[PDB]
Amino acid sequence: VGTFKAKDLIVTPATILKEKPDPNNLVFGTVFTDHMLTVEWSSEFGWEKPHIKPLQNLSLHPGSSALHYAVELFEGLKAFRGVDNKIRLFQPNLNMDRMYRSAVRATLPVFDKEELLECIQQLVKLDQEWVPYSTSASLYIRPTFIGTEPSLGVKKPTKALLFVLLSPVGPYFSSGTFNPVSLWANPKYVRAWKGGTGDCKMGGNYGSSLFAQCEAVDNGCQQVLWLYGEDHQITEVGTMNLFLYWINEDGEEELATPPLDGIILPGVTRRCILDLAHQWGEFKVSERYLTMDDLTTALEGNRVREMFGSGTACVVCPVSDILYKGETIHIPTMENGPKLASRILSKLTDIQYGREERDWTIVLS
Amino acid sequence: GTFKAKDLIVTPATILKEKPDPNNLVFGTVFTDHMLTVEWSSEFGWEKPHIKPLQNLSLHPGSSALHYAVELFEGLKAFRGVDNKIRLFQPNLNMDRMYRSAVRATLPVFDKEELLECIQQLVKLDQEWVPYSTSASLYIRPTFIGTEPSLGVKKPTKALLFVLLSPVGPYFSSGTFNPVSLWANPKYVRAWKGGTGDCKMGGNYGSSLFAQCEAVDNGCQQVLWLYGEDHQITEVGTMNLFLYWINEDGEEELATPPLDGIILPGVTRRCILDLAHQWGEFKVSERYLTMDDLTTALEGNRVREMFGSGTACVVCPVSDILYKGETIHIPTMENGPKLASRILSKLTDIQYGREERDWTIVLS
Numbered sequence: 261v262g263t264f265k266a267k268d269l270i271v272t273p274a275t276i277l278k279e280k281p282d283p284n285n286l287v288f289g290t291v292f293t294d295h296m297l298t299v300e301w302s303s304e305f306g307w308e309k310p311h312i313k314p315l316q317n318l319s320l321h322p323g324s325s326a327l328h329y330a331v332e333l334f335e336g337l338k339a340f341r342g343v344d345n346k347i348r349l350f351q352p353n354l355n356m357d358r359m360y361r362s363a364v365r366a367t368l369p370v371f372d373k374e375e376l377l378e379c380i381q382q383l384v385k386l387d388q389e390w391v392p393y394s395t396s397a398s399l400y401i402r403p404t405f406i407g408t409e410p411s412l413g414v415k416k417p418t419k420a421l422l423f424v425l426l427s428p429v430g431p432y433f434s435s436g437t438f439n440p441v442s443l444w445a446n447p448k449y450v451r452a453w454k455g456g457t458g459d460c461k462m463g464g465n466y467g468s469s470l471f472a473q474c475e476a477v478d479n480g481c482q483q484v485l486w487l488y489g490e491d492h493q494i495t496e497v498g499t500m501n502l503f504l505y506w507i508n509e510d511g512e513e514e515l516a517t518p519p520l521d522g523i524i525l526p527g528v529t530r531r532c533i534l535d536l537a538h539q540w541g542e543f544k545v546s547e548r549y550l551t552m553d554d555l556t557t558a559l560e561g562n563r564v565r566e567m568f569g570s571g572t573a574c575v576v577c578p579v580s581d582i583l584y585k586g587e588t589i590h591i592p593t594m595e596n597g598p599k600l601a602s603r604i605l606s607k608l609t610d611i612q613y614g615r616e617e618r619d620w621t622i623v624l625s
Numbered sequence: 626g627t628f629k630a631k632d633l634i635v636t637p638a639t640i641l642k643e644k645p646d647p648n649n650l651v652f653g654t655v656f657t658d659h660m661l662t663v664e665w666s667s668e669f670g671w672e673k674p675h676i677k678p679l680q681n682l683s684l685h686p687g688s689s690a691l692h693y694a695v696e697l698f699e700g701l702k703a704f705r706g707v708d709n710k711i712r713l714f715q716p717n718l719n720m721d722r723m724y725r726s727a728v729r730a731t732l733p734v735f736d737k738e739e740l741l742e743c744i745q746q747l748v749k750l751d752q753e754w755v756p757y758s759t760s761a762s763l764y765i766r767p768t769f770i771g772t773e774p775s776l777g778v779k780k781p782t783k784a785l786l787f788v789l790l791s792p793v794g795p796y797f798s799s800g801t802f803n804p805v806s807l808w809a810n811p812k813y814v815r816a817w818k819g820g821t822g823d824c825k826m827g828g829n830y831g832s833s834l835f836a837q838c839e840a841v842d843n844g845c846q847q848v849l850w851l852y853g854e855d856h857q858i859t860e861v862g863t864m865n866l867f868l869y870w871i872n873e874d875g876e877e878e879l880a881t882p883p884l885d886g887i888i889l890p891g892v893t894r895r896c897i898l899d900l901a902h903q904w905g906e907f908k909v910s911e912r913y914l915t916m917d918d919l920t921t922a923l924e925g926n927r928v929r930e931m932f933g934s935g936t937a938c939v940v941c942p943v944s945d946i947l948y949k950g951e952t953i954h955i956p957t958m959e960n961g962p963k964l965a966s967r968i969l970s971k972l973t974d975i976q977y978g979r980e981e982r983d984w985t986i987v988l989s
């Protein structure tokens with residue numbers, strides 16, 4: 261085992277620069293910056309030197325295991341141009357931890373988390389003018405890791421490529437204010453199972469979700485509510501972690517989210533919201549199982565305050581409605597402020613854009 | 626607007642590679658001279674199909690195939706018969722299964738007959754890759770990937786359908802029979818109810834590698850995939866699972882898990898059941914099998930044979946299973962293996978045209 265080193269970076273700047281888009285007219289993940297990071301690996305020689313070079317097509321053997329047996333994983337973290345014009349990463353160390361653990365589970369080769377993070381900072385620094393001049397826009401960082409073994413054998417790869425893409429993204433919604441979401445709840449589809457890879461950011465987990473999201477849009481919903489088990493546990497809202505703020509069965513004010521039992525992605529936003537909630541010490545915080553019966557029973561009892569999704573995508577996305585067994589079920593999130601959702605959004609946004617300081621942000625090299 | 630085989634644009638290779646020794650082959654390591662490629666866009670639909678020299682694909686690094694496993698594949702074989710006629714084997718089932726997988730993947734649909742005809746043209750051009758050996762074959766790998774240059778999780782608006790050919794030798798050195806050891810850890814699950822386990826989509830395989838590596842660590846060749854609280858035996862690696870035994874009612878029985886959505890509907894699986902029903906010599910049961918059923922039957926001397934079936938290994942006998950820290954012997958090779966041998970003979974006789982059958986088509 262070894263690692264590529266940031267001190268060995270070979271930088272090939274681009275001679276022609278692309279036009280930056282209007283920060284307002286940004287469609288998520290459609291526009292790419294001038295430069296990418298690439299690092300080759302072989303079982304024979306280990307990691308090659310890391311390269312920052314102009315964005316280009318990858319030349320892959322059509323046998324590459326990434327295209328056949330989804331021998332791939334990715335990450336999603338953001339760079340934010342603060343109110344003081346200082347560019348900040350947000351909990352990037354957690355994204356590096358999660359990516360290392362995903363590589364091990366994918367049988368892709370391990371790397372030094374610190375060396376990758378430093379390589380990423382160099383790339384963001386070179387293309388720093390892509391980090392949008394807007395307090396509601398950001399730069400998406402897409403670390404990607406693929407098996408390039410030119411062999412149809414189902415096996416641990418002996419060649420691989422780790423690359424990083426940068427994409428400027430506008431606010432999750434046109435305005436930037438809350439546009440509450442409708443969820444499609446069909447237990448017929450399942451995102452992840454116990455003993456699967458649901459708790460890793462591996463490409464395989466997402467391919468099977470598209471047909472379901474298409475079926476959500478057909479029934480006039482924005483996202484899928486992923487249900488697990490005989491008693492229909494609410495797990496995740498699309499590609500976001502699920503939070504329920506309510507009066508629990510014991511009459512206690514509670515923030516509830518499904519536990520990490522292997523079918524839940526340990527989101528960085530999920531980690532931050534739980535940390536904040538524990539820290540505030542104002543109500544009970546419970547990593548616990550939630551069913552549609554628990555929710556509908558609490559709704560008839562006027563015990564539900566707010567339900568919202570959390571991820572790098574939206575930060576905090578309130579839920580107004582769930583479509584389940586052919587009826588629309590209203591969640592009174594927007595009727596109750598949404599007081600907690602608003603508070604969380606303010607705190608994370610204030611940190612991301614350096615309106616306050618915290619350990620969760622690192623200023624760019 | 627589907628691509629048509631009539632529109633094929635053929636760019637032959639000017640230099641042809643050395644054909645490998647049919648004996649000294651590692652599976653899926655050697656590739657033929659030519660590949661099939663067909664580009665698709667939402668804006669313009671299907672391009673004309675291309676048969677051109679094997680080359681690297683030029684993909685945008687944002688291609689959805691590399692990020693959200695927007696990909697599927699197929700596996701079917703071409704066999705040079707004892708009469709030197711090249712035959713495909715139930716290829717229409719492979720085209721059906723691939724179409725259904727594309728729909729479930731939200732990849733654009735195509736005319737199954739036009740793809741099959743395009744595949745036959747490719748195999749015909751490279752027909753000398755189809756090995757001159759009654760225990761070797763040519764693997765056909767239709768592959769279908771989203772090339773949408775966008776990180777959005779969405780139905781792709783660009784895609785590529787390509788086909789590779791790879792000559793493959795007998796699964797084990799001689800081609801006689803070398804039984805496999807299975808690693809049975811219920812901690813890992815290949816597929817679940819409401820999943821894509823009944824499709825050949827790339828996502829199903831990426832999550833299997835860590836388990837296969839853990840099998841090789843404990844000196845096993847394959848994973849035995851266990852599902853549910855009562856540890857149902859589902860699949861032997863990337864092969865369907867068959868158990869030949871005296872059942873709980875004292876009846877001679879061929880048993881295999883049912884198609885409840887966690888089982889890949891294998892072509893070989895369908896053929897073995899068809900043959901078994903036809904022979905009418907013992908009971909045929911698509912039924913649930915547990916490790917408790919197996920171990921209870923083993924202590925009762927009721928187990929005759931266990932074997933895997935797939936395009937990979939037509940019939941692969943199982944000798945041993947590692948489960949809860951102990952090695953459990955299956956007496957497959959002690960009992961002939963009489964049934965496994967018979968099935969191997971019948972399918973091989975058909976594949977290599979020693980007898981005629983509806984299951985084979987002679988090459989265009």
Ligand SMILES: Cc1ccccc1Oc1cc(-n2c(=O)cc(C(F)(F)F)[nH]c2=O)c(C)cc1C#N
Nearest residue numbers: 288336400473482483498499572573776777778
């Ligand atoms: C790109 C990505 C992959 C895996 C997990 C998270 C993730 O992050 C995002 C997702 C989405 N996203 C979609 O791309 C698509 C739909 C929908 F399913 F509704 F079509 N929803 C959505 O939130 C968006 C709009 C932004 C980000 C960011 N940053």
Ligand SMILES: Cc1ccccc1Oc1cc(-n2c(=O)cc(C(F)(F)F)[nH]c2=O)c(C)cc1C#N
Nearest residue numbers: 412413414415652700764837846862863936937
């Ligand atoms: C390539 C493929 C993918 C999915 C389903 C079937 C399939 O076909 C084959 C698989 C394997 N195969 C492996 O590639 C890998 C392991 C192991 F589990 F050991 F890693 N076993 C194996 O049989 C072999 C040796 C031949 C073929 C053929 N033809």
Ligand SMILES: *Cc1c(COP(=O)(O)O)cnc(C)c1O
Nearest residue numbers: 499500501525527528529571572
């Ligand atoms: C990425 C992701 C999330 C959100 O994780 P963050 O690190 O907060 O962006 C939630 N669920 C799934 C399935 C994800 O892939």
Ligand SMILES: *Cc1c(COP(=O)(O)O)cnc(C)c1O
Nearest residue numbers: 863864865889891892893935936
């Ligand atoms: C391909 C495959 C099989 C074998 O199916 P055939 O059509 O007989 O080749 C079995 N199980 C899995 C999981 C497979 O992918």
Ligand SMILES: [Mg+2]
Nearest residue numbers: 627736738739
């Ligand atoms: Mg037609």
